[PDB]
């Protein structure tokens, strides 16, 4: 009774999903820890325009 | 149920009969054609015997003398060895379950298509101000005097706007020059 | 008058003498975040006010290793603060106690040495030795 | 090696004998600071007068819930000291271990919740809760444990 | 006895002769080409910073690197599809951290492969092997088949050899080939 | 129970979780994933010995039918145990020990101690018994 | 149809016509419908029994309605993200069919060349949610199989053309808040 | 230390300059398959060492 | 545990050992260096990447001096 | 607020700035008061530290790190000359006249 061309890509499903749902989870900690930078850097263009006036 | 109970128990040692061993722990060629859905209906029937002769065994090791050992003792052993039939079964379908899991988030990886504030990915060709060219030499030359020549010449800065030159060899060649360097 | 010379005062004698695990968790650089320096000498662009790609930064790079991330990548400039680091992870990430093996025999030419490394060099198997020098006839 | 500290000989050595100080290790006594630990507050010291949380509870890896059943080597000195010691409550009543047999804290059932003062537990995760949820084929194909022969 | 399978036809050193080359003299011997005399085409990728590459450096004309004469000014074009998941730091410290977790499996419980103090611990007496494993079982069978007579022939009790020492030596465990041993089990002799 | 964590011990786990030193491991997301294979291989193939003991459930009939258990299978799973593959559905207490393994020495004489197990009385609504035609 | 009126700060609202692709996708199309169409109304005082015996209290939750969300992400010359039910910041996702969805079938399908198209914004091919974007460049090849396309801007594209050309302030956010003040059915 | 290493293989056989103090008065018939196979094992274990 | 080893220090040119670390930046104590991509890569394969007139500049033979810290004597033949 | 006819000008000017290194300073981070308990007296510019108060303006007299550069820059306006006449295109076709023929 086994459907090989049917089951396989269910669980292929499971373990994908199981995977792409970590690897957001760990974009997270690190957009959490570098976001905070990269407007520190931003937030340093917008003063050195405004120093050079 | 009241009846309910009655399957923990065997029957013939209910009804006294000499029981009747095993006919066979179920074998691997027979087993990969079951589906996952009923792999696990013909589980718990394994589940339901390894039970049925665990409390069984247990009742004739309280009473070591009265009855004895536990007759056809090898039935137990056809069904843990039957399990693991199911448990290394499984495992080769969950193997390539998930091999073809890695192999298709691997290359979504490398595809970038993933980013976490959620949205779809800045173009591909956006970022890069780089221009790459396959110069083709005949002799090798030095790096560095590549670097010399074939650098910028308006940008001052050591790097002379080249981001990095390489030399490589073609396959045709590094076999062209293995076996040229065996025949040798 | 001592006191529990009982069982447990006699499996405590034998138990605790298990090797624990061990795992060379090495030093962590608390003020020197190494990550957080992805983001050094990145021109600004007065647009998107975010870094602009640099194609040359990531060859000023110096890829500092870690344990919990590959190879965290840091400016040229700003490589000499991870100078432990460097000399951490090159390291063998055992006390070298456990492969005083390789520095006492005449295992000390056969094996790479370098900041306590003590990796096999490469050796020839005996298919090669025999191959290599047959072929020339020696 | 008493003097592992930040050298500084003709200034003042701050922190010298205050909690955080350094010059005096790393796997040190002294460091009651460091009262910070992950496994919660009420399994170390009951949730009540009675001691009720008090145990070692060991927790499923999917299960975010802490227990404080580790096996680092700082932490084992006093996992043994609740398996062959136990806890005497200062209400009267030994805790988690009171007799003989000493309990196995790897073989506990997972830390399923919290507890509650009103409840027993909050039931903070039921996916540690196994409910053994195969279907009873009833229905067709009937299936004996074991197969016939040829 | 591999002694006697041996054949011999000089019977002292260059036991068996060594037949002639194919060349009168030596100079006579075809010469090849020498690996260093191929010179095939380098290929040298060169990127700049700049979108203005293949258009610049055929500006210079190159004909010559004093050796070169190069062949060909082709363009890669290796930016073609770049995710920006290979600039973005926020992206690429999501794999590079990946990387670790699936390296530190692989190498942290560094066990040998294999170690003389493992055929130590898999190997144990027979005054204890026997201990690790046993039951009445085994003079059962032996009161079993002396009436009822069923030829059996595997083990009832199923042996363990390793007396539960595979629970202290990986499984991955295996004696490496060894070189040159100084035994008689090559040579089988059946004589002496 | 020794809590020291032994070296080999994780070794032995890994070469059966994924063949270790020949296949490379499942990137870490699936492993903290009730997907991974022994988190698939539990939450669809249980691995469990519920024996029942029948000194207390033979001809005399008992509200309080006996078990033994594993040592980790708590109560409200016994629950969930018998209600979903024994269709016992009137457990209203269950009442759970803790017992060393039996122990003894064989005719060798090393001292060969069973696995241990747990006592979980449980008490049935309306009395179980069992026959025994002699 | 739909439609969806956009305040860019202290500017009117306008309307911007969405021509929702019912037919071929209809789990994330009628998401949007449900999402715009005000569909999920909760409201409640903690006085009269919300607190006491009902225990829903999901009304201190995210409420799966497009009113009063943000446009948050734009990047110029290529498109226009906005709308999310969880995060202000742009992050997390929020549906009709709990955190998120995939629908196989609707996720291979899609294909991303037309200018003005409307599809939902991932973090993963796995996850579906409020999340919308307008693509604003013509062209895009590398959305191919990421995300879903269910649906086109008819009209209104003025304020998709208009939202771009908004500065961006320090934080890669549009310097003059952009809201969705009203949206409902066409 | 010093050890004379430039007379191992500068004898006239196998079995010379090889300081083997473990003999025997009558080493038997496999005890000398033994002993033969070993003098030129240790000559040829040295060598293949030494070459590698 | 060390995820990504990293490559010996100066492991730039292609058919002779990089220099031993002190000298180019790192432990001293070691006096020979080696780097496992060189000695991996077989004998015509460092003979294909180069030609002759290459090796000779690799070659190089700076003999007391070392080549990197300029003016210091080099370090593989010292006494330590 | 930055006008619009000034911002041209900073974008096709030339220099532009690197403006990352803030991130390189290091960091102190700990329990606020085992922080601040060390900074019992004037700890600040003590021993490595240096309490960095961001700069927008730099004293020009003695400076090493802005005298090494202004220099460098007027040996890049210097430079800059040649590509503006063109004697830099050819002394740079000089070159590759004096490799080829060889």
Redesign the interface.
Same mark, same amino acid.
């Given at each position: 009774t086994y459907d090989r061309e049917k089951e396989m890509p269910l669980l292929v499903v499971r373990r994908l999903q199981a995977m792409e749902n970590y690897?957001v989870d760990?974009?997270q900690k690190?957009?959490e820890y570098?976001?905070a930078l990269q407007m520190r850097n931003a937030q340093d263009m917008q003063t050195f325009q405004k120093d050079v006036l | 149920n009241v009846a309910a109970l009655y399957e923990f128990v065997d029957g013939n040692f209910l009804n006294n009969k000499r029981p009747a061993i095993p006919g066979g722990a179920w074998p691997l060629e027979s087993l990969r054609r079951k589906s996952l859905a009923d792999l696990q209906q013909i589980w718990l029937s394994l589940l339901k015997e390894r039970n049925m002769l665990s409390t069984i065994k247990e009742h004739y090791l309280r009473h070591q003398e009265e009855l004895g050992?536990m007759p056809a003792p090898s039935r137990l052993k056809m069904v843990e060895e039957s399990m693991e039939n199911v448990k290394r079964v499984v495992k080769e379908r969950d193997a390539e379950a998930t091999a073809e899991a890695v192999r298709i988030f691997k290359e979504r990886?490398?595809?970038?298509?993933?980013?976490?504030p959620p949205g779809p990915?800045?173009?591909?060709?956006?970022? %890069?101000?780089?221009?790459?060219?396959?110069?083709?030499?005949?002799?090798?030359?030095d790096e560095e005097?590549?670097r010399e020549?074939?650098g910028?010449f308006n940008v001052f800065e050591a790097?002379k706007?080249?981001?990095?030159?390489?030399?490589?060899?073609?396959e %045709?060649?590094l076999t062209?020059?293995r076996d040229?360097?065996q025949?040798? | 008058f001592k006191q529990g010379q009982g069982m447990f005062s006699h499996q405590l004698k034998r138990i605790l003498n298990k090797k624990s695990?061990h795992?060379y968790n090495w030093d962590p650089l608390h003020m020197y975040d190494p990550?957080k320096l992805?983001?050094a000498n990145r021109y600004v662009d007065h647009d998107t006010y975010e870094e602009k790609?640099d194609?040359?930064w990531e060859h000023n790079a110096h890829l500092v290793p870690?344990?919990?991330?590959?190879?965290?990548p840091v400016p040229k400039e700003y490589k000499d603060a991870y100078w432990w680091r460097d000399l951490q992870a090159r390291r063998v990430?055992?006390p070298t106690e456990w492969v005083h093996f390789r520095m006492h025999t005449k295992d000390k030419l056969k094996y790479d040495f370098q900041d306590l490394a003590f990796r096999k060099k490469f050796e020839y198997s005996?298919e090669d030795v025999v191959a290599n020098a047959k072929d020339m006839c020696s | 090696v008493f003097h592992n500290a930040p050298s500084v000989y003709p200034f003042t050595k701050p922190f010298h004998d205050t909690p955080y100080d350094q010059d005096r290790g790393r796997f040190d006594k002294t460091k009651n600071i460091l009262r910070e630990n992950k496994w919660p507050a009420w399994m170390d010291h009951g949730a009540d007068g009675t001691g009720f949380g008090i145990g070692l509870n060991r927790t499923h890896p999917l299960s975010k819930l802490r227990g404080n059943l580790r096996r680092n080597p700082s932490e084992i000195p006093r996992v043994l000291n609740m398996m062959i010691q136990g806890v005497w409550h200062k209400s009267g009543n030994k805790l988690y271990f009171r007799g003989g047999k000493p309990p196995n804290p790897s073989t506990h059932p997972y830390l399923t919740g919290e507890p509650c003062p009103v409840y027993g537990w909050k039931v903070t995760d039921p996916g540690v809760i196994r409910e053994f949820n195969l279907p009873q084929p009833e229905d067709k194909t009937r299936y004996k444990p074991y197969v016939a022969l040829q | 006895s591999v002694l006697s399978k041996a054949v011999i036809q000089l019977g002292y050193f260059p036991n068996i002769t060594t037949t002639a080359p194919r060349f009168t003299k030596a100079d006579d011997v075809p010469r090849?080409?020498?690996?260093?005399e191929?010179?095939?085409?380098?290929?040298?990728?060169?990127?700049?910073?700049?979108?203005?590459?293949?258009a610049?450096?055929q500006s210079?004309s190159?004909?010559?690197?004093?050796?070169?004469?190069?062949?060909?000014?082709?363009?890669?074009?290796?930016?073609?599809?770049?995710?920006?998941?290979?600039?973005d730091?926020?992206?690429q410290?999501?794999?590079?951290?990946?990387?670790?977790?699936?390296?530190?499996?692989?190498?942290?419980?560094?066990?040998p492969?294999w170690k003389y103090q493992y055929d130590l611990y898999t190997k144990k007496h027979l005054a204890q092997v026997?201990?690790?494993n046993?039951?009445?079982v085994v003079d059962?069978v032996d009161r079993e088949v002396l009436l009822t007579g069923r030829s059996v022939w595997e083990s009832p009790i199923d042996i363990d050899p390793t007396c539960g020492g595979?629970?202290?030596?990986?499984?991955?465990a295996k004696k490496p080939k060894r070189?040159?041993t100084?035994g008689?089990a090559e040579?089988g002799?059946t004589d002496? | 129970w020794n809590p020291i964590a032994g070296?080999?011990?994780? *070794?032995?786990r890994?070469?059966?979780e994924w063949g270790?030193?020949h296949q490379?491991?499942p990137?870490?997301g699936l492993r903290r994933s009730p997907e991974y294979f022994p988190f698939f291989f539990s939450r669809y193939f249980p691995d469990v010995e519920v024996r029942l003991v029948l000194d207390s459930v033979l001809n005399n009939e008992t509200t309080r039918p006996i078990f033994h258990i594993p040592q980790d299978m708590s109560k409200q799973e016994l629950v969930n145990y018998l209600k979903n593959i024994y269709n016992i559905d009137n457990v209203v207490r269950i009442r759970v020990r803790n017992m060393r393994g039996r122990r003894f020495k064989?005719? *060798?004489?090393?001292i060969?101690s069973l696995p241990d197990y747990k006592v979980a009385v449980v008490e049935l609504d309306s009395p179980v018994s069992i026959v025994f035609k002699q | 149809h739909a439609f969806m009126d956009i305040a860019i700060g202290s500017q009117p609202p306008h309307r911007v016509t969405f021509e929702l692709f019912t037919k071929r996708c209809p789990i994330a199309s009628e998401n949007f419908l449900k999402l715009c169409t005000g569909e999920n109304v909760l409201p409640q005082v903690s006085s009269i029994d919300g607190i006491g015996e009902p225990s829903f209290r999901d009304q201190f939750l995210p409420q799966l309605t497009y009113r009063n969300t943000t446009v948050h992400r734009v990047c110029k010359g290529y498109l226009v993200q906005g709308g999310d039910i969880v995060s202000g910041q742009g992050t997390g996702q929020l549906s009709i069919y709990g955190e998120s969805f995939d629908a196989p079938e609707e996720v291979k399908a899609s294909k991303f060349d037309r200018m003005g198209l409307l599809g939902t914004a991932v973090s993963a091919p796995h996850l579906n949610g409020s999340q919308f974007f307008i693509l604003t460049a013509d062209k895009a090849p590398?959305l191919n199989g990421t995300c879903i396309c269910f649906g086109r801007v008819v009209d209104g594209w003025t304020v998709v053309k208009a939202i771009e050309a908004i500065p961006l302030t320090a934080a890669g956010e549009p310097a003059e808040r952009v809201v969705v003040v009203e949206c409902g059915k066409l | 230390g010093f050890t004379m290493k430039y007379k191992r293989g500068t004898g006239l056989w196998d079995e010379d300059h090889v300081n083997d103090f473990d003999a025997n008065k009558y080493l038997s018939?496999?005890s000398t398959?033994?002993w033969y196979?070993?003098m030129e094992?240790l000559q040829?274990?040295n060598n293949?060492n030494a070459r590698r | 545990?060390?995820?990504?080893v990293p490559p010996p220090r100066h492991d730039v040119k292609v058919t002779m050992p990089p220099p031993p670390g002190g000298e180019v930046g790192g432990s001293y104590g070691v006096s020979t260096g080696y780097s496992d991509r060189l000695a991996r890569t077989p004998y015509?394969k460092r003979?294909?990447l180069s030609?002759?007139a290459l090796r000779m500049k690799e070659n190089e033979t700076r003999y007391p001096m070392s080549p990197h810290r300029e003016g210091e004597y080099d370090l593989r033949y010292t006494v330590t | 607020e930055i006008p619009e006819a000034a911002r041209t000008v900073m974008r096709s000017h030339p220099l532009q700035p690197q403006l990352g290194f803030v991130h390189a300073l290091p960091t102190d981070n700990r329990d606020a008061v085992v922080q601040e308990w060390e900074r019992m007296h004037h700890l600040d510019w003590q021993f490595g530290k240096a309490v960095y108060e961001p700069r927008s303006a730099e004293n020009e007299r003695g400076n090493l790190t802005w005298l090494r550069e202004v220099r460098h820059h007027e040996a890049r306006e210097a430079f800059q000359a040649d590509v503006d006449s063109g004697e830099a295109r050819r002394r740079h076709?000089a070159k590759?006249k004096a $490799? $080829?023929?060889?």
């Open positions: 690897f760990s974009l690190s957009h570098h976001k | 050992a990886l490398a595809k970038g298509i993933y980013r976490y990915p800045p173009p591909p060709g956006a970022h %890069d101000p780089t221009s790459t060219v396959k110069l083709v030499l005949s002799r090798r030359v005097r590549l020549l074939l910028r790097h706007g080249i981001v990095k030159l390489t030399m490589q060899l073609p %045709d060649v062209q020059k040229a360097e025949l040798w | 695990l795992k990550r992805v983001h790609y194609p040359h870690d344990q919990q991330f590959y190879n965290i990430q055992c005996y | - | 090849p080409v020498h690996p260093d191929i010179e095939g085409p380098w290929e040298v990728r060169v990127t700049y910073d700049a979108k203005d590459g293949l610049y450096v210079l190159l004909t010559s690197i004093d050796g070169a004469a190069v062949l060909s000014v082709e363009e890669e074009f290796p930016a073609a599809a770049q995710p920006y998941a290979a600039v730091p926020v992206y410290e999501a794999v590079r951290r990946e990387m670790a977790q699936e390296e530190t499996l692989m190498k942290w419980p560094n066990v492969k026997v201990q690790y046993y039951s009445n059962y595979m629970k202290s030596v990986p499984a991955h070189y040159m100084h008689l040579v002799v002496i | 070296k080999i011990g994780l *070794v032995n890994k070469a059966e270790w030193p490379r491991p990137p870490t064989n005719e *060798v004489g090393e060969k | 590398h | 018939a496999r398959m033994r196979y070993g094992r040829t274990r293949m | 545990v060390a995820p990504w015509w003979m294909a030609t002759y | 076709m590759i $490799a $080829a023929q060889v």
